[PDB]
């Protein structure tokens, strides 16, 4: 099972959302829909792209010649020319290949870590006014409209304003 | 009243290889390796390279009676030959320092 290979805390992911790479699906009265975390995608697209740009741009270029010709009485030159040309060929294959396998995990781990820290951000923003329903889905004990919901997407949230509402939750349980 | 965490994922057949696994499918990818060629030579450094028609460098430099179609092709960037150039030198002999002549004549203005 490939999904078992990663054993990630999040499921396969969504497809309806199109305006980002990491986002939220806010549900509430009169307010359902998807959303995108504009802070994370712009700050994650650039670094990954610059890694690709760094790889591409650092291949400096200069005029190069082909393997020259030699007569049958100068075979030593021909094999020396083959040895140097093959040495570079063998070097670049291993160097180029092992770079894109070692740095493919770096970007894949970067994406996995990006989900986790963003997931941690909502957890710490509000702690007792939420229930761990399951795979990265909280449930608000209180009532929270769209203006309230944007507080989670912001870095702003007034715990004491809603902590007293969590006292009403304590009454239900 | 729920908020959930997820990541965008669209339909794509792109595949990439890594160390923990292989043949994994990803959304967007960029390659470094080019394996496509036009199949036709082109004017490279703004100057049309000369094309030798059934002739070799020694045969044409020495002025064989053939290879007369390539006299007005002075400036170039490189020289294109034929895999088995036949009409080279008519009178047989051993052309001294052949290889060095080709390298020096590989580029002129």
């Amino acid at each position, epitope marked *: 099972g490939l999904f078992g290979a990663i054993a990630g805390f999040i*499921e396969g992911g*969504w*497809t*309806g959302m199109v305006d980002g790479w990491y986002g939220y*699906h806010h*549900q*509430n*009265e*009169q*307010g*359902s*829909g998807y959303a995108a975390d504009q802070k994370s995608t712009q700050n994650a697209i650039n670094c990954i792209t610059n890694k690709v740009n760094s790889v591409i741009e650092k291949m400096n270029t200069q005029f190069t010649a082909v393997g020259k010709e030699f007569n049958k009485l100068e075979r030593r030159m021909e094999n020396l020319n083959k040895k140097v040309d093959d040495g570079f060929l063998d070097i670049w294959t291993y160097n180029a290949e092992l770079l894109v396998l070692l740095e493919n995990e770096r970007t894949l781990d970067f994406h996995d870590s990006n989900v986790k820290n963003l997931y941690e951000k909502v957890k710490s923003q509000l702690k007792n006014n939420a*229930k761990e*329903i*399951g*795979n990265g*889905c909280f*449930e608000f*004990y209180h009532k929270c409209n769209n203006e309230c919901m944007e507080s989670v997407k912001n870095g702003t949230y007034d715990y004491p304003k809603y902590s007293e509402e969590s006292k009403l939750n304590r009454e239900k349980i | *009243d*729920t908020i*959930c965490i*997820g990541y965008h994922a669209n339909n794509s057949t792109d595949t990439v290889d890594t160390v923990c696994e292989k043949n994994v499918t990803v959304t967007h990818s960029v390659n470094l390796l080019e394996d496509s060629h036009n199949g036709k030579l082109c004017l490279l450094k703004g100057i049309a390279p000369l094309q030798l028609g059934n002739c070799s460098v020694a045969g044409w430099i020495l002025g064989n009676p053939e290879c007369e179609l390539l006299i007005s092709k002075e400036s170039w960037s490189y020289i294109v030959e034929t895999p088995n150039p036949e009409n080279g030198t008519c009178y047989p002999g051993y052309f001294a320092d052949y290889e060095e002549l080709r390298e020096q004549l590989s580029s002129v203005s």
Partner: antibody, heavy 123, light 108 residues
Framework: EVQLLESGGGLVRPGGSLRLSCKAS????????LSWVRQAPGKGLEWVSS????????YYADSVKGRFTISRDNSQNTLYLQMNSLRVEDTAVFYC????????????????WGQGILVTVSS | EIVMTQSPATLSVSPGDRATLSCRAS??????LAWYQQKPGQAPRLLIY???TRATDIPARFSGSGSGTEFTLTISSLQSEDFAVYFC??????????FGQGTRLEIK
């Protein structure tokens, strides 16, 4: 297989109250939601209410908003439909539908459908 | 709320032919849509969830196609069982749910 049972239909006058019990079996009720749909005679279905797991998420259709109440019992794996102030246009069958999942995303499509029951009104 | 409608309403077609009836959609509701059967006599069932795949134990002669507002349904072959009432549902925005008005198909 998944089977549901419904009861509580009959004749209720305006201003009364009715309780429809909707039992659930064959699937994990704790981790799955439930909802209700209503079909007037001759017209299309008009969804009324849907409730997610553990009785923390409640939503009601605007037509009956503020005058219906829904509760669930995990031990008896049954759902209730509490309501009052019967209408004259509310003569409709009331089916039971199973929400996909609680923790999942894309939610709303119904897999299992019970027979339902008939609730009417009289002058 | 999200308003949905289907049109035309009444249509009769010979069995085994092709008959498609599309239901419009306000907004876009992405690809999230459901189509339901209702044979005369019992409760409705489910055919296509997500507008791309069939449910469990469903004949494959149906076809779920469409995107955004333009949403259509087509059937490869029609039998005497297929003559039923069709409902199309959207669930992208889910404070409310809105069904169609139902399209009836019959013969004889």
């Amino acid at each position: 297989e998944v089977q549901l049972l419904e009861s509580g239909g009959g004749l209720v006058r305006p201003g009364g109250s009715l309780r429809l019990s909707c039992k659930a079996s064959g699937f994990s009720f704790s981790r799955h939601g439930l909802s209700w749909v209503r079909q007037a005679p001759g017209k299309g279905l008009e969804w009324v209410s849907s409730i997610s797991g553990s009785s923390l998420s409640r939503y009601y259709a605007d037509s009956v908003k503020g005058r219906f109440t829904i509760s669930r019992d995990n031990s008896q794996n049954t759902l209730y439909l509490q309501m009052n102030s019967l209408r004259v246009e509310d003569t409709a069958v009331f089916y039971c539908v199973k929400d996909r999942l609680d923790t999942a995303v894309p939610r709303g499509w119904f897999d299992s459908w019970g027979q339902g029951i008939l609730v009417t009104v009289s002058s | 709320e999200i308003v949905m409608t289907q049109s035309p309403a009444t249509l009769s077609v010979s069995p085994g032919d092709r008959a498609t009836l599309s239901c419009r959609a306000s907004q876009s509701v992405s690809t999230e849509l459901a189509w339901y059967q209702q044979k005369p006599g019992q409760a409705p069932r489910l055919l296509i969830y997500g507008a791309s795949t069939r449910a469990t134990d469903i004949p494959a002669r149906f076809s779920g196609s469409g995107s955004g507002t333009e949403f259509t349904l087509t059937i490869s072959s029609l039998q005497s069982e297929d003559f039923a009432v069709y409902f199309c549902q959207q669930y992208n925005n889910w404070p409310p749910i809105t069904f169609g008005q139902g399209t009836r198909l019959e013969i004889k």
